[PDB]
Design a protein around this ligand. Sequence first.
Ligand SMILES: C[N+]1(C)[C@@H]2C[C@@H](OC(=O)Nc3ccc(F)cc3-c3cccs3)C[C@H]1[C@@H]1O[C@@H]12
Ligand SMILES: OC[C@H]1O[C@H](O[C@H]2[C@H](O)[C@@H](O)[C@@H](O)O[C@@H]2CO)[C@H](O)[C@@H](O)[C@@H]1O
Length: 394
Amino acid sequence: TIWQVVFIAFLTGFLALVTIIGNILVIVAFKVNKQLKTVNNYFLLSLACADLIIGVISMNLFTTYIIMNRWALGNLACDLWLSIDYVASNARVMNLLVISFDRYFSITRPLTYRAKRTTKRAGVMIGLAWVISFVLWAPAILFWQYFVGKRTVPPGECFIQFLSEPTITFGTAIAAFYMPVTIMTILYWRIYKETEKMNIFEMLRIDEGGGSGGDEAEKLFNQDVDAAVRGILRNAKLKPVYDSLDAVRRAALINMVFQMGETGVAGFTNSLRMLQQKRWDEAAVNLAKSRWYNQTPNRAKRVITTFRTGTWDAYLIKEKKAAQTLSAILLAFIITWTPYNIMVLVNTFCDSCIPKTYWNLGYWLCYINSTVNPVCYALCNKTFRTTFKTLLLC
Ligand SMILES: C[N+]1(C)[C@@H]2C[C@@H](OC(=O)Nc3ccc(F)cc3-c3cccs3)C[C@H]1[C@@H]1O[C@@H]12
Ligand SMILES: OC[C@H]1O[C@H](O[C@H]2[C@H](O)[C@@H](O)[C@@H](O)O[C@@H]2CO)[C@H](O)[C@@H](O)[C@@H]1O
């Protein structure tokens, strides 16, 4: 009826508009901001590309197929839609796998990947994913009707030919969706556990803004930090404070003796006392007024924060921020696409058990995943929230 056509036509355009607006802003945010240009940001820019294609082409075309209750766009337009639709969405699963192995390899491979991240190398990865995804689906969808000779697709209907068999589709959804989902789940929970770990060596690494130097180099770092402890114990002016501190706040003390020496730190007589009196906020205010805070306010602010809170917050906030962002991107991907794939599994053991409508809903729901990503960006990352605001108004 007229009600069903206008109702459908509204929310598809409403969702299509949100998608196009959001993904078009994030792409501008990367070009309009010199502070958003990171390796991680480059990847997310790739998703917006595939996501923007979905919001522009796939939503309007497929929305016409379901509205008119039949496909009338022509035969060659059908092979382009399905191919582009499947090549783009497949690149999305590729980008997510790369984003996962980026953080994972960034958190597990400080030797090579941590120090091998180049915005030029990134382009190679995105290049692989897009070219690979194109090859897997474009030729198969376009030319399959030629290898078999005839076309199984009735006129006025548009669907992938070689996917007509349900058993063949089940194996395809396994490799295309389930397996990538399984891997990304494995990498996440490992990255998640990594976000809670921190010691004095990584504390000094971060403060120094440096990196590893192999085995021989890492053994020397251990000697120097070990000797730093002895100096504190041999020093009669520091050992009292050190012995009355917790494992975290002790690392903060070693962080100072490492930067200024035993005698230099022993000069903080008042501050070294308030620490032994566990008057954290009072000692923090005192250390803030020293020259040491004016000569290295970044390193001091973190070490001082450690004394106040007694936690690794100043040395882990960056890692957690990314972890939360990745959790959102994954969760959106899992929530929206799972229905459709669960139908593929069900339909494999059922001659006909899914109505034509349930399939069309899962198909459009998968599209919605391309609508939520820009929202997740602005919700978690603060830089996107401000950059998006200055684009609409300013
Ligand atoms: C546009 N989509 C709505 C996207 C999401 C849905 O695909 C899925 O969830 N998995 C699949 C199930 C069977 C199959 F043979 C291939 C797929 C996939 C193709 C690319 C990534 S998985 C259905 C279509 C498809 O292009 C994707
Ligand atoms: O700047 C030299 C440094 O000597 C001590 O600190 C570290 C030093 O940075 C390491 O290279 C290695 O030598 O171990 C030393 C500590 O045992 C002082 O503690 C430090 O103040 C001084 O700057």
